[PDB]
Structures are given as structure tokens and as C-alpha cells.
Scaffold this active site. Structure first.
Site, PDB file in Angstrom:
ATOM      1  N   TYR A 209       0.823  -1.195   0.000  1.00 33.63           N
ATOM      2  CA  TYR A 209       0.000   0.000   0.000  1.00 33.63           C
ATOM      3  C   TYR A 209       0.863   1.253   0.000  1.00 33.63           C
ATOM      4  O   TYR A 209       1.961   1.285   0.560  1.00 33.63           O
ATOM      5  CB  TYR A 209      -0.946   0.026   1.203  1.00 33.63           C
ATOM      6  CG  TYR A 209      -0.268   0.220   2.539  1.00 33.63           C
ATOM      7  CD1 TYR A 209       0.219  -0.862   3.255  1.00 33.63           C
ATOM      8  CD2 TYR A 209      -0.133   1.486   3.090  1.00 33.63           C
ATOM      9  CE1 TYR A 209       0.833  -0.688   4.478  1.00 33.63           C
ATOM     10  CE2 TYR A 209       0.479   1.669   4.311  1.00 33.63           C
ATOM     11  CZ  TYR A 209       0.961   0.579   5.002  1.00 33.63           C
ATOM     12  OH  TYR A 209       1.571   0.754   6.222  1.00 33.63           O
TER      13      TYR A 209
ATOM     14  N   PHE B 192       1.884   9.901   3.135  1.00 32.15           N
ATOM     15  CA  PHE B 192       2.196   9.756   4.552  1.00 32.15           C
ATOM     16  C   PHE B 192       2.659   8.354   4.922  1.00 32.15           C
ATOM     17  O   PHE B 192       3.332   8.183   5.942  1.00 32.15           O
ATOM     18  CB  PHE B 192       0.976  10.130   5.401  1.00 32.15           C
ATOM     19  CG  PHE B 192      -0.200   9.215   5.217  1.00 32.15           C
ATOM     20  CD1 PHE B 192      -1.178   9.502   4.283  1.00 32.15           C
ATOM     21  CD2 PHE B 192      -0.335   8.072   5.987  1.00 32.15           C
ATOM     22  CE1 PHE B 192      -2.261   8.666   4.114  1.00 32.15           C
ATOM     23  CE2 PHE B 192      -1.415   7.233   5.822  1.00 32.15           C
ATOM     24  CZ  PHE B 192      -2.380   7.532   4.885  1.00 32.15           C
ATOM     25  N   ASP B 193       2.320   7.344   4.125  1.00 30.86           N
ATOM     26  CA  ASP B 193       2.730   5.979   4.418  1.00 30.86           C
ATOM     27  C   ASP B 193       2.877   5.201   3.121  1.00 30.86           C
ATOM     28  O   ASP B 193       2.205   5.487   2.128  1.00 30.86           O
ATOM     29  CB  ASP B 193       1.725   5.277   5.338  1.00 30.86           C
ATOM     30  CG  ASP B 193       2.297   4.030   5.985  1.00 30.86           C
ATOM     31  OD1 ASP B 193       3.526   3.827   5.908  1.00 30.86           O
ATOM     32  OD2 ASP B 193       1.517   3.259   6.582  1.00 30.86           O
TER      33      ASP B 193
ATOM     34  N   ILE C 109      -8.348  -0.242   9.884  1.00 31.20           N
ATOM     35  CA  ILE C 109      -9.553   0.574   9.979  1.00 31.20           C
ATOM     36  C   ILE C 109     -10.625   0.055   9.027  1.00 31.20           C
ATOM     37  O   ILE C 109     -10.359  -0.782   8.153  1.00 31.20           O
ATOM     38  CB  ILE C 109      -9.247   2.062   9.717  1.00 31.20           C
ATOM     39  CG1 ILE C 109      -8.530   2.250   8.382  1.00 31.20           C
ATOM     40  CG2 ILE C 109      -8.405   2.635  10.849  1.00 31.20           C
ATOM     41  CD1 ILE C 109      -8.539   3.676   7.869  1.00 31.20           C
TER      42      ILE C 109
ATOM     43  N   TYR D 243      -9.365   7.246  10.703  1.00 35.04           N
ATOM     44  CA  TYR D 243      -9.030   7.703  12.049  1.00 35.04           C
ATOM     45  C   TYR D 243     -10.037   8.728  12.560  1.00 35.04           C
ATOM     46  O   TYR D 243     -10.269   8.829  13.771  1.00 35.04           O
ATOM     47  CB  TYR D 243      -7.616   8.279  12.056  1.00 35.04           C
ATOM     48  CG  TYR D 243      -6.562   7.250  11.722  1.00 35.04           C
ATOM     49  CD1 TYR D 243      -6.426   6.097  12.482  1.00 35.04           C
ATOM     50  CD2 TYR D 243      -5.721   7.419  10.632  1.00 35.04           C
ATOM     51  CE1 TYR D 243      -5.472   5.150  12.177  1.00 35.04           C
ATOM     52  CE2 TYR D 243      -4.766   6.477  10.318  1.00 35.04           C
ATOM     53  CZ  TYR D 243      -4.646   5.344  11.093  1.00 35.04           C
ATOM     54  OH  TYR D 243      -3.695   4.402  10.785  1.00 35.04           O
TER      55      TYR D 243
ATOM     56  N   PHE E 163      -5.552   5.509  -0.853  1.00 34.36           N
ATOM     57  CA  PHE E 163      -4.556   4.448  -0.783  1.00 34.36           C
ATOM     58  C   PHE E 163      -4.475   3.734  -2.123  1.00 34.36           C
ATOM     59  O   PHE E 163      -5.503   3.384  -2.704  1.00 34.36           O
ATOM     60  CB  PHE E 163      -4.903   3.435   0.312  1.00 34.36           C
ATOM     61  CG  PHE E 163      -4.794   3.982   1.704  1.00 34.36           C
ATOM     62  CD1 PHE E 163      -3.564   4.099   2.324  1.00 34.36           C
ATOM     63  CD2 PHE E 163      -5.926   4.370   2.396  1.00 34.36           C
ATOM     64  CE1 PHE E 163      -3.465   4.599   3.606  1.00 34.36           C
ATOM     65  CE2 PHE E 163      -5.832   4.870   3.678  1.00 34.36           C
ATOM     66  CZ  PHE E 163      -4.602   4.984   4.283  1.00 34.36           C
TER      67      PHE E 163
END
Ligand SMILES: Nc1ncnc2c1ncn2[C@@H]1O[C@H](COP(=O)(O)OP(=O)(O)OP(=O)(O)O)[C@@H](O)[C@H]1O
Lengths: 48, 144, 806, 107
Positions: D26, D36-37, D56, D82, D99
Site C-alpha cells: 500500500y 504519509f505511508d 480501519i 481515524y 490508498f
């Protein structure tokens, strides 16, 4: 938004045939053009 | 050419006669190359030939050349300078110490025909003494 | 990235054929994937230039260009009326795949630095014959025309029979049958009329060019005799070419130079006539489709056809001389192309600032693959990219195109090089001198001094530098591999000079002068432009005023100036669905922000554009108007008609001051200042402008999350030009509230130190990547097409400035 | 919530089932486009078990929808992510997440 951001990115380059076409008043060039690109091999993720 | 230049540097009369000859005959040393000591043909022909003299000397001989120039500054004669180099042959620069000598040695050994050079200590003293004398007298000439 | 619907959507994967079709008339660009229409089009884009096929990629692909004809086998038939792209290859070029605006190239001995390329303009394909309609043919030239048409036809038939053409009822290349191969008087009416018109056009253009033509000898006309021809040259019908002999005639060099112009004019006139009739250009001739291989302006024409036309026109002028009319060549007149600014025209490649040398004796080499404009030498670390090498005091260079030494001007020095010559540059910082050697020989000045420059102050240091003009190639050898140097041993090694990068374990990094315009803060010491930060009084908001320091004086610089405020306003991610005292609730809940620009009296509003620019604006256009603004409409639709979205994308959103100039006030200097206010609704993405408190018709719509910089494009016309007023209006928040989070609910106008004026700079220094992607291009086959391959990954760590999106 | 758009096709037959480990690569970006990731950066596939509430709701449902060998873009709202609290220091409060997710295999 304030601190400078860093990340690793791939280099990207462009390739063209030496074919140039345009439109102008009184121009000698045809107005409609067509070409194709066939994709033989692609690696979805060669890097991150 | 270096011997002739050495005579030019040593003898004052030679310099004055060259200056006269050129002045009266209105020679054009600039035209010859393409008066002032720089325009002098005696020193100019040397300046042109000197790179060959330096080519004879191996890069290791730089320190020995410096010492020979120091002796010629001491005004030692050529034969006793020759003996000085003969007895001080060991001081020839070490390639390991300085990085520059490494890349100079690369070219010196790469050039064909100079691999045999430096084999003979008598040859080494020959070349070092000659080039050192030429360089010393050239330094005195260029100094005002 | 705007998603576009297509059957079986997927990212380009192996065995995918993307068909791209460009219709320049609409104009529009459309795509097909595996023969399935892609429900999306580009349209209404700028047509100021030439379009070319292009594929952009990172490492890890293998693709093939299919251009039709013999250079590619189309998998799907082109849509009706669309021509294969292989037909667009110009006569003087052979089709091949090339990079775009490369500044670096691989070479045998090493990488080659490449200067800017010369690009044809869309206007270069418009034939522009000299205006000859005004000229009226004198009768003596009319009578000569009557015979000139026939004689040109005789020469035409002679050439045709010489190459093997024979008469026939219909024209076919394979049959080698030619219908027009008859006597000129017996020629079909249309062709004969065209031939007469061209024969008269020759004389008329002779007059138009400024040349003088006048009869000298009458007896020459009676003396001239047509050459007898053999039975083989005699034509099947019985026609025989009868060109008049001109063995006695001789041509002057000026007359030949004029013949070149005559041939160019004739070809251009023919091309214009055929374009008017509807013909176009194609690498492959198609008479039924009105496509010709030669229908291009003369300059772009092939060498062989140029020579044929030159021979025909030289024979024509020989015929005129034989008739005896004296011809006087007109003197050449001065003309300057001034295509681009010379300062920014040449690419400058220098060593990185950290490599500057302040002592010792250093050597490097520059091989000139081309014989054109190139400079090589030593520059100081603070060298400017816009200034030419050696024009200022920063660089000591040698320009051996003509043999000059450049430092604070040009002086004759040395001799020009030929192709493949190596210039060894030497700097002795112990003697403070610079020496240049050509092919191992020290270049000497006119006075005869060996040193090119003398009494050089060390300063910060010195760096290897070169400058390449348009179309030039040079190889810079900094001496990392000492054996690679070609003339170091011959000159430089014994003199004690050391290669610049002799003991450097890695190749020396270089920086080149990138010609992409960039917004940079206005220098605090700019000679001509001054920006003053003015505090906000009771009756005035905070202001940033521009003033022209050198207006109305010698050395004054008057040119288009593009200005933007450093901080952008960003539109909201999600758009809303569907006295003079601020109201406490409306002012707090409003999402509209306002800023004004005051164009001062004496500054023509016709020379001012006020508005916003995205972070993508990079146009340093000296002749700027709203038509130059980039703009494209992306239209999404259903599989049949039913357009769903018609978004418009542009980098500049502005209004012209000429619109607000009153028609009566137009043509006269106005004593009043013009205030143009700009309002943006960050929630609805709607942009509006007001002029002197009056709503203007112009309005813009932007997509969510767009960044916009306040901007002003002005051509100065007064010492006081413009003033960014960062104020507010009743129930509209100030611009600082949008710009700064901490002041988001503060209705008091503010101009913090970060907010400042920035001007567009044409060129900027940019680091050259140490490693470059290896792309292999090759013609796979007649049916396979051309092939591009890139398999080796290559990555970089990128530092991103959030505000500028760069 | 979660919206799924197929970047590249999968087998179209094998789908994740509850209690079955999913291995993915991902790349996570905010709705603004800021990354961010990314698991590809760590060069190690991320493995998670469906029905264990380890990821999540957006991952749960979107990856359940995807098929083996499929690459897809997942748009996840704040409520399905979140949410109001966010991830302090990484995800701003009340942020939509995008994502790029490739489902390698199921184990
Ligand atoms: N390619 C060209 N370049 C320059 N001049 C041309 C060219 N083609 C035609 N012309 C001019 O037009 C004349 C052609 O006359 P004409 O119409 O009889 O020829 P055509 O038979 O139609 O031509 P083609 O030789 O192409 O079959 C030439 O003599 C010359 O004056």
C-alpha cells in the site's frame, strides 16, 4: 506546509519522433494526424 | 642550447654584445618568435626547448633537482655538484609519500621508451645536473 | 489527473495499443484504447507552436511507436480523414526517435554537453512570397514574358526527355507518360495560363526585389537560335524542345545570389497557390488527395529540389541576358533575425561552487565537436546565468568561433578552431594568469603575449565553465582520467599544471543555466526596480509599491515585468454545495477574500494585467497579451455524446486594464489612478474582478484545492507603476486572512515580512544529475515500428517546497 | 464509506474471506495528495487478518471487495478512518485518505 518535504522519486524522461505538425493561416500542413503506441513490457513497480 | 644559455648567463660581455647587435640591426625578436631580456633569442630558444629537458628527468628527481639548484646557488662547480648528487642519490622523492608523484609516475611509465630511463645512476646524475643548472640560470635570468 | 471512463479500465499494461488522434481544426486531441473510445477529450488548447507525438516514462518499460506506412503497422484503422504521422517527416530529415531539449548526450570519449536546439515554428510552414501585385510589367518585359514562358517550357521538356519522360494521353509515373509534353501554344489552357503567369512573375519579382532590368541590345534577340535536337529527343507526337542556346552568356556572382532569391520566391509563390487551391504536404505523394512531397516553404525544401529550381531560374536569367536586357543586382540590405535574447540563448555549464580553486596551477580540456559559438574558460563562483560569459567581470573565457578573448568585453585573440579541436584551459593562480592552448599550441594575442589574461585577483576562486550556443556540442574533460587528456602531455604537464579533477574519486558535479523562468524575490539592489513596503494608515491599507528607479534616463530598461506575491491562497478541498462597518457574523463566516492593485497615473492601463497565477506559470513573454495565456478544456462525456464535464484549466487568470479604460479616456493620458480589485471565494471557487468599484464582466471558475498567487504583469510607462494594496471591503476578509492560518479569523489587513513581491527571472542555475536514464531507441522493423526501451531503475531524493508546489 | 477504483485487474474469482490473512503493498496519501505511508518504501508487504479489527474500516471493507492480484485505489472517509481524533503527527484531524493498494496473495 512549512517544513521542506523530502521523498524518493523516479527519474522520468520523454521520447518523441521527429514529427512536428501545427496549424497557421496559409500553412502547408495537414490538420488531422494519427499515431499509435504498443506497450510490450511494463513493470508496475520496478522501484518503490 | 642550455650550454649556450649558461654561457650567456655567466658572461656579461655576451649579453652586452647581443643587446648591441639587436639594437643596431633593428632585429624584431617578436617577429622571430611569432631589447628586453625576455625577447632575447638566447633565452627564448631555451624556454622553448626546456620541456624536453624536463621530460628527460623522471618525476622522482624533483627533490634532487631542487638540491642541485641549491648547490648552484651555493655556486658549486658542475663536477662537485655531480659528486653531490652521486652521493645523495637516495634522497630522490618517494612516490608513496606524495599523491602527485603517483599520477606523474603513471604517465612517465605509460609513455613508451622511458621504462629504461632511471635504470642507471650515472644517467640520473647526468640529467639532474644538466636540468638543474639550466633551471637555476633561468631563475637568475627571470629575476630582475 | 482527471479520471476518464473507458471499457475495461486499467493502467497501461502489456499488449495495450493506445491510438492518439489530433484534429488541429477544432482543435481537439482524442484517444482510443485497444480500439475502444476513451470517453474524454482535450480541446480549445493553444495553437502557438508545433505538435509532436510524445511518450513519457520512468525506467522499466518497453514500448513501440507505430507511425503507419513502413515505420509502423497500425493495429486499428485510423479514423476517417486522419493522416498517418509518418507522412509528416520533413524532406530534409529522416524519421527517428530522439529526446526532447537534451543538454547532455553520451559520447565515445565521454558525455557531450549540448546547447539549445533550433526548433521550427508553426509559421515557418507558411510560404511568404514577396508582394509583386503592386509592380506593373513594362511592355518590353511583357514581350519578353511571351517568349520566356515558351523557353521555360522548352527547358522543362528537355529535362523530362533527358530523364526519360515520354508523351502520353494521361499522366502516370510508372507509365512514364506525360500529357503536357507538347508545344507551348498547344498546351492545355489551364497549364498554359499558369506557365504564362509564372513567366511574368519572374520578371515582376525581378523588378520587386529592387533589381533594375532594361533592354541593351536588340540584335541579340535576332541572333539567338534554338538548339537542334536529335530524333531520340524528338517526341512521340512530334514535339521537339527548342531551348535557345546561351553558351555565350555568363553570370556574375551577384546575379547568382539573385537567382537563389528568384528560385526561393518562385517556389514560395507556387506553394501559396497550391495551398489556396487546398493542397498540403505529405512525405508520400497522393495526387487524388492533394498531398505533395514538395509543398513546403523553400527553406525547408530538400537540397536536390533546391538545386533543380536554382538551375531552372539560372537558365531563365541566362535567357534574359541572351535577349540582352541588362540586369543590375540590388545591394544587400542589413537585416537582423534577433530570434532570441543572446544572454539567455546560450547554455552555460560550470563546475559546482564547492570545487572553486584559490591556489595552484590547474588544467582542463574542451573539445569542440561543432565549429559554432562556444566559449570556454574560468568563471567565479558568483557567475550569473543570464549574462553572457565574459560580458561581465565574472568570467575569463575564450570564444574561438571567431578567435576572441572575453572578459568585460571582447578582444581579438588566438585563431578559430575546426571540428574536433581541443582547447586546453590553464589557470596559474601563483602567477595570476590564464593560458589557452589550441591542439597543444599556446594561443597568442596580437601583441604576442602568451598569457591570455593577467593580474587576475584570486577572489573567491575559479571554476571551469563553458557556454554553448544553439546547436553546438562540446566535450568537457576535467582530467579525472589523466590518460584521457589528449594534449596535457604536449602542453601543461611539464609546466607544472595539474588536471582539475586529477585526484577526485568521483566525477565533478556540474550546474547548467536552465532557461525555465522562475519567480524569485526582487533583489534589494536591483538597478531599475524598487519595491517599498508601506504601512497601513487609517485611510490606506498595507501596500507594496513598485517604482522604476531609472525611468526617463539613459540606460533605462523598459520591458514586460511579471510580478507575484510570494504567498498563495489555496481554495478549499470541498466546495459548498449549490456606515461601511463589517457585520460581525457575516465577516466571520465569509469565505471571500479581496486584494486590489492601484495602477498609478501616468502608467498606461493598457499595459497592465492584474489577477492571479498558479504555481505553474513559466512564461517570460516580452510581447504579452491575454491571448498568450495557456488554456485547455478537458471534456468528459458518456459513451455516446452526453458531455458530463467541460472543465477549463489555465495557469493565468487576469483582466486587462484596456477593458476598464474608458473609450473617451482612451488615447489620452489619465490623471486618475486605476484601482482593480480581485475577489476570490475559497468555498465556491469563483473569481471576480471590479474596476473602480464597478463589477466587471470577466469571471473565472477554478477546481477545489487550487493554489493562486496574486499577480501583476506590467510594461512600465512611469516612475510610479503599480501598488499591491492588501486591504479589504465590507464583509470581505483581507488577503492575509486567507494566506495565514493564525490570522484566518482576523479581519485586520496585514502584510507580514514573508509576504513580498517576486519577479519572473528568465534563467536559473540548476544542478545536472550525476547519472542519467539509459534509453535505447531502435527501429524494430517495418511492421513492428520504432521501439523505446528503458530497464534500469534510477531514483533521486527530492526536496519539495510546499507553498510553491515545486 | 469506502470507494474502490480498479487501477489494474485481478483474477476476478478469489476474494478475501473473514479470518484469512491478506498480504498487500500500500501507498497512503492524504486527499491533498501528500504521501504519509507506504509499505513499498519499507520493502516488506503488510499482512493483516480480516475480521480481527487490526486495520480501519476502510481497509477492512475495501480489501474485502478486492480480488487477489488486483491493484486498486481506495478512498476512505474520515468516519471510516481515524476520524476526528486522527493520527497525531501523521494524519490531520478529519482527513480523507487515498490508498493505492495491491493485493498480492491470501494466506
Ligand atoms: N515544385 C516546384 N517548384 C518550383 N516551381 C514549380 C514547381 N512545380 C511547378 N512549378 C512552376 O510551375 C510550372 C509547372 O507548370 P505546369 O502546370 O504545366 O506543370 P505540371 O505538369 O502540372 O507539373 P508537374 O511537373 O508536377 O507534373 C513549372 O514550370 C514552374 O514554373
Amino acid at each position: 506546509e512549512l517544513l521542506l518535504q523530502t521523498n524518493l522519486i523516479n527519474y522520468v524522461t520523454s521520447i518523441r519522433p521527429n514529427i512536428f505538425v501545427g496549424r497557421a493561416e496559409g500553412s502547408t500542413q495537414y490538420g488531422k494526424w494519427y499515431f499509435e503506441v504498443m506497450v510490450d513490457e511494463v513493470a508496475p513497480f520496478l522501484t518503490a | 642550447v642550455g650550454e649556450i644559455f649558461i654561457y650567456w648567463s655567466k658572461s656579461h660581455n655576451f649579453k652586452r654584445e647581443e643587446q648591441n647587435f639587436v639594437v643596431q640591426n633593428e632585429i624584431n625578436n617578436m617577429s622571430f618568435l611569432t631589447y628586453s631580456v625576455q625577447t632575447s633569442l638566447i633565452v627564448a630558444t631555451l624556454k622553448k626547448m626546456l620541456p624536453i629537458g624536463l621530460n628527460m628527468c623522471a618525476p622522482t628527481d624533483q627533490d634532487l633537482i631542487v638540491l642541485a639548484k641549491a648547490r648552484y646557488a651555493l655556486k658549486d662547480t658542475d663536477e662537485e655538484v655531480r659528486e653531490f648528487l652521486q652521493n645523495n642519490l637516495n634522497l630522490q622523492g618517494k612516490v608513496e609519500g606524495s599523491p602527485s608523484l603517483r599520477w606523474q609516475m603513471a604517465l612517465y611509465r605509460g609513455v613508451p621508451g622511458r621504462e629504461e630511463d632511471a635504470d642507471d645512476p650515472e644517467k640520473i646524475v647526468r640529467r639532474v645536473q644538466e636540468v638543474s643548472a639550466v633551471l637555476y640560470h633561468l631563475d637568475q635570468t627571470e629575476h630582475p | 489527473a482527471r479520471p476518464v471512463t473507458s471499457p475495461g479500465q486499467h493502467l497501461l499494461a502489456p499488449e495495450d495499443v493506445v491510438s492518439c488522434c489530433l484534429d488541429l481544426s477544432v482543435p481537439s486531441i482524442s484517444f482510443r484504447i485497444n480500439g475502444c473510445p476513451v470517453q474524454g477529450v482535450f480541446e480549445s488548447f493553444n495553437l502557438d507552436g508545433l505538435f509532436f507525438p510524445v511518450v513519457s516514462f520512468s525506467a522499466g518499460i518497453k514500448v513501440r511507436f507505430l507511425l503507419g506506412g513502413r515505420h509502423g503497422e497500425f493495429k486499428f484503422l485510423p479514423p476517417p480523414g486522419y493522416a498517418p504521422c509518418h507522412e509528416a517527416v520533413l524532406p530534409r530529415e529522416r524519421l527517428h526517435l530522439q529526446p526532447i531539449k537534451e543538454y547532455r548526450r553520451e559520447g565515445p570519449r565521454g558525455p557531450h554537453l549540448v546547447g539549445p536546439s533550433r526548433c521550427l515554428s508553426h509559421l515557418d510552414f507558411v510560404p511568404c512570397p514577396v508582394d509583386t501585385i503592386q509592380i506593373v510589367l513594362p511592355p518590353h518585359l511583357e514581350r519578353i514574358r511571351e517568349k520566356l514562358a515558351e523557353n521555360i517550357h522548352e527547358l522543362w521538356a528537355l529535362t523530362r526527355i533527358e530523364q526519360g519522360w515520354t508523351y502520353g494521353p494521361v499522366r502516370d509515373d510508372n507509365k512514364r507518360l506525360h500529357p503536357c509534353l507538347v508545344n507551348f501554344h498547344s498546351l492545355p489552357e489551364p497549364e498554359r495560363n499558369y506557365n504564362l503567369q509564372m513567366s511574368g512573375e519572374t520578371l515582376k519579382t525581378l523588378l520587386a526585389l529592387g533589381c533594375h532590368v532594361g533592354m541593351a541590345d536588340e540584335k541579340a534577340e535576332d541572333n539567338l537560335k534554338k538548339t537542334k535536337l536529335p530524333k531520340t529527343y524528338m517526341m512521340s507526337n512530334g514535339y521537339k524542345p527548342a531551348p535557345l542556346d546561351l553558351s555565350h552568356v555568363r553570370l556574375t556572382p551577384a546575379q547568382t545570389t539573385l537567382v537563389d532569391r528568384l528560385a526561393e520566391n518562385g517556389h514560395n509563390v507556387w506553394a501559396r497557390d497550391r495551398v489556396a487551391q487546398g493542397w498540403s504536404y505529405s512525405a508520400v505523394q497522393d495526387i487524388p488527395a492533394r498531398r505533395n512531397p514538395r509543398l513546403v516553404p523553400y527553406r525547408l525544401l530538400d537540397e536536390a529540389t533546391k538545386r533543380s529550381n536554382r538551375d531552372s531560374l539560372c537558365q531563365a536569367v541566362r535567357t534574359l541576358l541572351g535577349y540582352g536586357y541588362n540586369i543590375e543586382p540590388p545591394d544587400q540590405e542589413p537585416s537582423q533575425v534577433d530570434s532570441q535574447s543572446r544572454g539567455d540563448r546560450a547554455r552555460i555549464f560550470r563546475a559546482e561552487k564547492s570545487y572553486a580553486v584559490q591556489s595552484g596551477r590547474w588544467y582542463f580540456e574542451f573539445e569542440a565537436v561543432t565549429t559554432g559559438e562556444m566559449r570556454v574558460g574560468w568563471a567565479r563562483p558568483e557567475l550569473r546565468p543570464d549574462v553572457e560569459l565574459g560580458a561581465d567581470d565574472l568570467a575569463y573565457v575564450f570564444n574561438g568561433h571567431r578567435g576572441q578573448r572575453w572578459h568585460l568585453g571582447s578582444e581579438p585573440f588566438g585563431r578559430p578552431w575546426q571540428s574536433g579541436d581541443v582547447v586546453g584551459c590553464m589557470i596559474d593562480l601563483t602567477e595570476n594568469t590564464i593560458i589557452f592552448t589550441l591542439n597543444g599550441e599556446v594561443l597568442m594575442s596580437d601583441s604576442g603575449s602568451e598569457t591570455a589574461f593577467r593580474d587576475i585577483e584570486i577572489g573567491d576562486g575559479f571554476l571551469p565553465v563553458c557556454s554553448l550556443g544553439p546547436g553546438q556540442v562540446g566535450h568537457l574533460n576535467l582530467g579525472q582520467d589523466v590518460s584521457s587528456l589528449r594534449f596535457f602531455a604536449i602542453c601543461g604537464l611539464q609546466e607544472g599544471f595539474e588536471p582539475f579533477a586529477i585526484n577526485m574519486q568521483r566525477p565533478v558535479t556540474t550546474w547548467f543555466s536552465k532557461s525555465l523562468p522562475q519567480f524569485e524575490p526582487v533583489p534589494l539592489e536591483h538597478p531599475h526596480y524598487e519595491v517599498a513596503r508601506m504601512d497601513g494608515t487609517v485611510d490606506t491599507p498595507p501596500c507594496l509599491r513598485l517604482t522604476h528607479r531609472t525611468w526617463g534616463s539613459q540606460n533605462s530598461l523598459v520591458e514586460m515585468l511579471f510580478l507575484r506575491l510570494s504567498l498563495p491562497v489555496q481554495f478549499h478541498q470541498h466546495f459548498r454545495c449549490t456606515d461601511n462597518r463589517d457585520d460581525p457574523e457575516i465577516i466571520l463566516n465569509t469565505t471571500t477574500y479581496y486584494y486590489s492593485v492601484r495602477v498609478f497615473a501616468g502608467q498606461e492601463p493598457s499595459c497592465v494585467w492584474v489577477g492571479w497565477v498558479t504555481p505553474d506559470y513559466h512564461q517570460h513573454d516580452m510581447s504579452f497579451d491575454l491571448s498568450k495565456v495557456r488554456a485547455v478544456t478537458v471534456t468528459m462525456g458518456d459513451e455516446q455524446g452526453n458531455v458530463h464535464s467541460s472543465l477549463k484549466c489555465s495557469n493565468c487568470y487576469m483582466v486587462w486594464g484596456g477593458d476598464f479604460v474608458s473609450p473617451g479616456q482612451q488615447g489620452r493620458i489619465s490623471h486618475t489612478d486605476l484601482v482593480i480589485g480581485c475577489l476570490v471565494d475559497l468555498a465556491t471557487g469563483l473569481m471576480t474582478f471590479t474596476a473602480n468599484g464597478k463589477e466587471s464582466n470577466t469571471f473565472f471558475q477554478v477546481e477545489p484545492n487550487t493554489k493562486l498567487f496574486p499577480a501583476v504583469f506590467v510594461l512600465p510607462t512611469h516612475q510610479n507603476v503599480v501598488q499591491f494594496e492588501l486591504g479589504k471591503q465590507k464583509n470581505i476578509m483581507p488577503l492575509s486572512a486567507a494566506m495565514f492560518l493564525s490570522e484566518r479569523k482576523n479581519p485586520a489587513p496585514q502584510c507580514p515580512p514573508r509576504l513580498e513581491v517576486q519577479m519572473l527571472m528568465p534563467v536559473s542555475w540548476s544542478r545536472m544529475p550525476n547519472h542519467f536514464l539509459q534509453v535505447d531507441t531502435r527501429r524494430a522493423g517495418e511492421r513492428l515500428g520504432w521501439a523505446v526501451q528503458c530497464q534500469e531503475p534510477l531514483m533521486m531524493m527530492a526536496l519539495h517546497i510546499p507553498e510553491e508546489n515545486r | 464509506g469506502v470507494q474502490v477504483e480498479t487501477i489494474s485487474p485481478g483474477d476476478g474469482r478469489t476474494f478475501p474471506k473473514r479470518g484469512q490473512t491478506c498480504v498487500v503493498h500500500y501507498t497512503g496519501m492524504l486527499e491533498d495528495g501528500k504521501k504519509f505511508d507506504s509499505s513499498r518504501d519499507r520493502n516488506k508487504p503488510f499482512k493483516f487478518t480480516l475480521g480481527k479489527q487490526e486495520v480501519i474500516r476502510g481497509w477492512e471493507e475495501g480489501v474485502a471487495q478486492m480480488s487477489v492480484g488486483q491493484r486498486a485505489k481506495l478512498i476512505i472517509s474520515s468516519d471510516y478512518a481515524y476520524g476526528a481524533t486522527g493520527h497525531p503527527g501523521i494524519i490531520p484531524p478529519h482527513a480523507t485518505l487515498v490508498f493505492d493498494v495491491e493485493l498480492l496473495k491470501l494466506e
